Amino acid sequence: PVIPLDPARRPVIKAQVDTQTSHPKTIEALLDTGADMTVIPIALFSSNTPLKNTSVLGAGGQTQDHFKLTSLPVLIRLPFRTTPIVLTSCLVDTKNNWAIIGRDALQQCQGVLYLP
Amino acid sequence: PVIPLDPARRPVIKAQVDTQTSHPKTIEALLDTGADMTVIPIALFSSNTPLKNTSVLGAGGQTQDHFKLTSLPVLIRLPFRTTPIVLTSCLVDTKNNWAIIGRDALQQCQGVLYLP
Numbered sequence: 420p421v422i423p424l425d426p427a428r429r430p431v432i433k434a435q436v437d438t439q440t441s442h443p444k445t446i447e448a449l450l451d452t453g454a455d456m457t458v459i460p461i462a463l464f465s466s467n468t469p470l471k472n473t474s475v476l477g478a479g480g481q482t483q484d485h486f487k488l489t490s491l492p493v494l495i496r497l498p499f500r501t502t503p504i505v506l507t508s509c510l511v512d513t514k515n516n517w518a519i520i521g522r523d524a525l526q527q528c529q530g531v532l533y534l535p
Numbered sequence: 536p537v538i539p540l541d542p543a544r545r546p547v548i549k550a551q552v553d554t555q556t557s558h559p560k561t562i563e564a565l566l567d568t569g570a571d572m573t574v575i576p577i578a579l580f581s582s583n584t585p586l587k588n589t590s591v592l593g594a595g596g597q598t599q600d601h602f603k604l605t606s607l608p609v610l611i612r613l614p615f616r617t618t619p620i621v622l623t624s625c626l627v628d629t630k631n632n633w634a635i636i637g638r639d640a641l642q643q644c645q646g647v648l649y650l651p
């Protein structure tokens with residue numbers, strides 16, 4: 420679908436995410452052309468799973484602690500299309516429960532920006 | 536234009552930004568549907584403008600040193616339209632001098648996200 424862009428309303432989508440360490444869960448994610456990679460909340464992962472340290476630069480600053488990197492690919496199913504997005508890896512929010520669909524996922528569902 | 540999305544290339548455009556505190560200047564800005572508000576570099580402003588402190592939530596978390604708010608509206612001319620976008624205020628990055636076109640500006644140019 421076409422998602423209008425509105426400062427007062429964050430463009431979001433329901434996405435079924437399977438981290439392959441837990442039953443797949445559907446979450447609300449922000450659609451974010453400004454994110455190099457997708458961010459999944461740590462909650463969707465089972466307690467014990469190996470995750471890699473990683474450094475992330477955001478607007479608030481550079482962090483070595485807040486985010487981890489997955490070890491297994493994450494599969495994402497969008498409401499409209501039946502084929503899953505397969506992300507070889509993406510980020511995990513250990514801290515603030517964030518869910519962000521970045522350009523890695525947007526590329527695979529052939530998302531575009533349109534500026535008339 | 537239609538702008539494709541690719542994890543390995545930031546979606547950017549050249550814009551002319553007028554802060555009304557000196558002459559209009561060209562910047563290359565990130566098109567960012569995850570940004571509630573536009574971000575322009577402090578480098579645009581002279582060494583003694585007055586800018587209000589502001590708190591912002593980013594990926595590095597809550598920052599309250601990094602961004603200021605303009606005191607005057609900012610006018611933005613995009614290559615493909617004659618009428619400038621006029622933002623009542625936007626964020627000013629004093630740390631990294633980032634340029635990010637957010638949803639406030641995208642709404643004014645009727646920007647949309649399209650997922651097939």
Ligand SMILES: COC(=O)N[C@H](C(=O)N[C@H](C(=O)N[C@@H](Cc1ccccc1)[C@H](O)C(=O)N1CSC(C)(C)[C@H]1C(=O)NCC(C)(C)C)C(C)(C)C)c1ccccc1
Pocket residue numbers: 429451452453454455456457458475476477478479510517519521565567568569570571572573574590591592593594595626635637
């Ligand atoms: C109350 O006023 C606000 O705090 N607005 C915030 C905002 O828009 N922050 C933007 C922001 O950082 N948005 C980002 C998404 C985001 C929103 C809130 C917390 C964390 C992340 C942005 O689309 C992005 O990907 N950016 C901006 S900077 C960047 C490096 C180019 C890239 C990035 O962070 N990449 C890192 C990853 C891949 C982890 C997202 C600004 C500072 C650029 C205006 C906000 C507050 C709650 C939910 C959503 C947004």
